[PDB]
Design a binder for these strands. Structure first.
Lengths: 50, 52, 129, 126
RNA sequence: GGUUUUGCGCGAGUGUUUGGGUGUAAAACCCGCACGCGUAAAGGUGAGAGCUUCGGCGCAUCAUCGACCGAUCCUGAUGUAUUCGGAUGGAUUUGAGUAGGAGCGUUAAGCCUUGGACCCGAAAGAUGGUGAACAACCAUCUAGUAGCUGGUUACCGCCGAAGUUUCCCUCAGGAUAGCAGUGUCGACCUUCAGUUUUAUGAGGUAAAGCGAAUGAACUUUAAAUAUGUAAGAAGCCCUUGUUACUUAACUGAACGUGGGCAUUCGAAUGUAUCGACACUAGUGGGCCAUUUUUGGUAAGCAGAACUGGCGAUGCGGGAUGAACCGAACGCGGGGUUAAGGUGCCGGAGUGGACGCUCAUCAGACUGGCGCUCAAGCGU
């Protein structure tokens, strides 16, 4: 993993595989997760998932 | 000493959420919709759907 | 830390006493004394009678001087004021000059009994290098 | 242009005069002035290597160096923040001071009246 | 013999053991004069641990403004033996200087220099002898020395690299910084960040339009893609004096001003923290791949920066390896997967839908057997 996406993944508390976090959808955070798209899978949770 | 799943153990759910008993009793998960005759889809929407 | 580097058993006794104090009181004085008890000899430089005589100047003459080191005699100081000093060790000339001036000499356990939290104390450190 | 010692200065480097030209790694950079001469100016600029940063002191003369327009946002922000906080304290109401990161859009409706959608195909044949 | 650190005794002093006395006799006990080393020959302001009678007092240390001295630069006093001296006011002065001592001795560990010097390993050279018959041998100096080999002895745990920047000069190299670690000090999620966002730098680079002007160099708008800078308290703004500076001139700079903002104190997210000082081992290969860029050849190829890995990496796949894909490691039980697979070897489908292909050595996201409405190919 290149150092900049690895820094993003350490900033999002995703330092291990199959790790989940809740992120408020913000254009700064949106650009961060669009940067680390080759490593993550993300989407909109419903009430049951939370 | 031992984490118990509230979705499997009902007593743990009642400990964390006291509303679970009356949520299950009053059937707020099987709530029905508002009654009355529903209107029909407008023709404009249907002609927009099956366009060229 | 976990243990003092000193092999002096009485130093370890003082370390146990001030571990208890630091744990069971909200006094930063006891924590600082415990930290300085853990420290090495080069990090605890000798404090001379003249340096204490300087620091006992404005409104501290009625306070109890606390030195976690050895107080040494200073020949440059001609007149020794009245002083209540609590320290690890005293040299013979320093102790004799303190008691000859009407002052008093204390160890750290007498300080821990008379002043368990360090009220109205004057913590003094020796010069570095 | 006159330059002080300690101002944030950005360099762009043209090809008009080849005297005292810096390398393309310094092309279009930004630094801080510590030295001013009759012609040249000494600028500290940060430099990346592997895992760390090294400051480098470089000399560029007048026609490629200019005062940067990166800092004026700080002064305008402190001026407006002070002034609307003064108005908020005078009027006794809370007001918003920070910068918001532009939350996503809310819900709304668009009318089909006078805006009938057109149907398209991958190629525009006409 | 130096040097760093831990413990210990005494401490402006410290060290009995050259020696003397003594003894239950190489022990232990005592010390008269020396000698070695060291010491001698307190100011303001702001932070700051700690204390507080809540008013404040403020360690160590740092910053800044001052004070004194060896000596240096002029001005050159009363005086002077009449050719000596330095009083007052000035300097961008220094110092291994002062500004309320820290050392001495010992123990343990590490490092450096010299002695055989971690162990073994030349050709030689010298001294003194033994023999012959046209230099050789013996003993010693000598455990000689130079490079360069080979070897260098229980276990477990924790932490763990580099194969680079710069300088100087022998060629036969060191120093500095970097990566790893230790102690001290200062704060402490204050603050910091291989990061996004906002403004900003070089690319208006692509595009769209020119029923707008003008002509990729056209532009209202504006990509993609990467990379510097700033995001308040170490802060803001303006007003007024001084300065050794600067300019025609507060034209700017620095030193003195004032105000209010601690209940969005002035984006996001993370924060199991960072900075400085001091001290200590191992290392200075190259290779592959990517992105961008330049040039040449019949074609390969050559020159730059970039990160990721290898050296120092085990496991699942990959027909062996290697590269490449997955994923990085305490000992076990259960469940689920990644890459890759489900005709047999081999665990799991001769699974399903649609077509194509018969190849006199097809083809296999084939290794072998073998396969043909596949066990091949595409979804």
């Amino acid at each position: 993993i290149p150092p900049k996406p690895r820094k993003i993944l350490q900033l999002l508390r995703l330092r291990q595989i199959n790790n989940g976090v809740f992120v408020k959808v913000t254009k700064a955070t949106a650009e961060m997760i669009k940067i680390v798209e080759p490593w993550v899978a993300y989407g909109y949770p419903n009430l049951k998932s939370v | 000493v031992q984490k118990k799943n509230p979705l499997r153990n009902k007593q743990i759910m009642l400990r964390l959420n006291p509303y679970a008993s009356t949520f299950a009793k009053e059937k707020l998960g099987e709530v029905k919709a508002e009654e009355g005759k529903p209107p029909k889809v407008p023709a404009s929407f249907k002609e927009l759907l099956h366009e060229a | 830390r976990k243990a003092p580097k000193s092999d002096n058993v009485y130093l370890k006794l003082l370390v146990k006493l001030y571990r208890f104090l630091a744990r069971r009181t909200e006094a930063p004085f006891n924590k600082v004394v415990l930290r300085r008890l853990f420290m090495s000899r080069i990090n605890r430089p000798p404090v001379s009678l003249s340096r204490i005589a300087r620091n006992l100047k404005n409104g501290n003459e009625k306070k109890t001087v606390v030195v976690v080191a050895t107080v040494t005699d200073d020949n440059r100081l001609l007149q020794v004021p009245k002083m209540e000093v609590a320290a690890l060790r005293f040299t013979a000339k320093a102790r004799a000059r303190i008691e000859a001036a009407g002052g008093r000499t204390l160890t750290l356990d007498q300080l821990a009994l008379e002043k368990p939290t360090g009220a109205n104390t004057l913590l003094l450190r020796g010069p570095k290098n | 242009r006159t330059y002080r010692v300690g101002d944030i200065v950005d360099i762009k480097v043209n090809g008009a005069v080849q005297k005292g030209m810096p390398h393309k790694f310094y092309h279009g950079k930004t630094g801080v002035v510590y030295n001013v001469t009759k012609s040249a100016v000494g600028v500290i600029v940060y430099k990346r290597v592997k895992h760390r940063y090294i400051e480098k002191r470089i000399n560029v003369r007048i026609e490629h160096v200019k005062p940067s327009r990166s800092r004026e946002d700080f002064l305008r922000r402190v001026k407006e923040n002070a002034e609307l906080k003064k108005k908020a304290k005078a009027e006794g109401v809370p007001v918003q001071l920070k910068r918001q990161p532009a939350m996503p859009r809310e819900a709304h409706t668009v009318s089909i009246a006078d805006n009938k959608p057109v149907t398209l195909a991958p190629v525009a044949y006409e």
